[PDB]
Design a protein around this ligand. Structure first.
Ligand SMILES: *C(=N)[C@H](C[C@@H]1CCNC1=O)NC(=O)[C@@H]1[C@@H]2[C@H](CN1C(=O)[C@@H](NC(=O)C(F)(F)F)C(C)(C)C)C2(C)C
Ligand SMILES: CC(C)(C)[C@H](NC(=O)C(F)(F)F)C(=O)N1C[C@H]2[C@@H]([C@H]1C(=O)N[C@H](C=N)C[C@@H]1CCNC1=O)C2(C)C
Lengths: 302, 302
């Protein structure tokens, strides 16, 4: 039994973390084959940066690349969107099987927080609908990566770039394309209003049922339209026919039809939790996907 | 910024996890140097589960009755010894991935990371605390047994928990790596139960100090309290009594925020008398007791 906020084992990714230094700026790089990936704002001096020019003007020896106590020699450099690629003289002997993926809002991943190329902590995250993440990042955390594991293949999906005024976090996929309407300048930027990831709440209520927690279940059923009208009143994501099909395995497993569980969720939105908890939370949790619930409640290895 | 339940990177422990088989029972082992440590109930059949005589079953085992497997490689068992409730298996090869490690027995309130493993392959990593009643609120299915709890201090791994059994209230019990149970439990399928759990008061106060540091002050008041008056009230809410020792430990957080420990205790007191009233601290509508004073300083300062 049990239900925990659970990260992927971070071992495969720890074998890839390095330290990148430019003048006085130090942050983290992802060392895969003979290339080190890191945010391009590493090159930046104190003084609206012109990255293209700052990059082309700069020699190879200006990039100090440190893998533990070993120096890596940079033998090339190129830009891809908002990520800098440093061509190194050594293929990473610890390189796992990996692909770069870009994730949709509501999709979850593990962040490996690092400082000075040194992995510090791992935590589970969700891509918010406003494309921010509620992470935990201090100074030097930039270049820290988000990832999933599928068997032995690490799918890297996130590189950390910045903290927003609301204490929430912004970054790019490993191809340097920002998630959300952001720019890597010190310019004034702000998270749009977040919404609750409805399908995830429903998956987590299924996790509640599976662990013997049933007080919120009722005998009513609703329709998508009625549910979706109530949802957008509480800043909940619309529920699609897609979502309903993806929760099917959980509906089948528990014997509770999705459109019933939507009625249960509706009552909770309108009525609150009545001084009760669900899986030990006073808040409806939306950072577990349907897959996450199936993975944890079936067990799955790598 | 941000405040996340945060586990240690699992790489150094992933390198040590093995699968141990005896008869039809397979669970997980911890492979350190030329010893595999695992729960001794791996040698129990179905019948044995109620009043196992461990000495009488192990005296009936040869080395070759224990299958130890590391990935594809089957390890060769060359000696078997019992220490309390862990079995120690001497093996041909010393684990080359052996990190700096020590074995540590922790006290209730102390936190660690759990690497949930099945068939010697890791499933996920989460962060736990030893509950006052010597149980943990884990996430463990069939065959999770021998999964370990650890902390990492620089590059030294300290092993503090090995997983043995699930109690009827869906909470978990285990031993230190010397095989002495945390709490009054025994590795038998006889009727046993956890004492009533209490809230880890020192940890909730730590979490409140973090809240101020991350800029949230909605909950403070202008009162102070005596240590005795605090405990007289706090026990009435099933809180762990606060000791002078605990007050000493909070000194640094008290210094950094400028809020006296007994002033913070007045705040906590009022929160219990009222509750949240729809408001939250650090994204929670409950009081968090699974961050220690050390955890908070590490994640918010440096
Ligand atoms: C190890 N592979 C399992 C794992 C359990 C069940 C799912 N999550 C877990 O932590 N553990 C066991 O097989 C141990 C083992 C005998 C019985 N047992 C139990 O987990 C049982 N609990 C108790 O012994 C009891 F009653 F005291 F709570 C069970 C009732 C099956 C849950 C031994 C030797 C303790
Ligand atoms: C909040 C701050 C003023 C620091 C700024 N944010 C904004 O620019 C905004 F406020 F305008 F949004 C910001 O983070 N950066 C400024 C500069 C890079 C980025 C940066 O160096 N990031 C930190 C790096 N190791 C990570 C931080 C530390 C604490 N928690 C984090 O995550 C770039 C946007 C090019």
């Amino acid at each position: 039994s049990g239900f925990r906020k659970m990260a992927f084992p971070s071992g495969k990714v720890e074998g890839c973390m390095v330290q990148v230094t430019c003048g006085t700026t130090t942050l983290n790089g992802l060392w895969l084959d003979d290339v080190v990936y890191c945010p391009r704002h590493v090159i930046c001096t104190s003084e609206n940066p012109n990255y293209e020019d700052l990059l082309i003007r700069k020699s190879n020896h200006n990039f100090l690349v440190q893998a533990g106590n070993v120096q890596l020699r940079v033998i090339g450099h190129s830009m891809q969107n908002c990520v800098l690629k440093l061509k190194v003289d050594t293929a990473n002997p610890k390189t796992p099987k990996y692909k770069f993926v870009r994730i949709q809002p509501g999709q979850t991943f593990s962040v490996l927080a690092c400082y000075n190329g040194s992995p510090s902590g791992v935590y589970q995250c969700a891509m918010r609908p406003n494309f921010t993440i509620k992470g935990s990042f201090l100074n030097g955390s930039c270049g820290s990566v988000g990832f999933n594991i599928d068997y032995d293949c690490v799918s890297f999906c996130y590189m950390h770039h910045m903290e927003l005024p609301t204490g929430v976090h912004a970054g790019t996929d490993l191809e340097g394309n920002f998630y959300g309407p952001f720019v890597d300048r010190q310019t004034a930027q702000s998270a749009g209003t977040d919404t609750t990831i409805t399908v995830n709440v429903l998956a987590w209520l299924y996790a509640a049922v599976i662990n013997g927690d049933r007080w919120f279940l009722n005998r009513f059923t609703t329709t998508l339209n009625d549910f979706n009208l109530v949802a957008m009143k509480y800043n909940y994501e619309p529920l699609t026919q897609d979502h309903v099909d993806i929760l099917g395995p959980l509906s089948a497993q528990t014997g509770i039809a999705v459109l019933d569980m939507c009625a249960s969720l509706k009552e909770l939105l309108q009525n609150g939790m009545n001084g009760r908890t669900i899986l030990g939370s006073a808040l409806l949790e939306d950072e577990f996907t349907p897959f996450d619930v199936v993975r944890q409640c079936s067990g799955v290895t790598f």
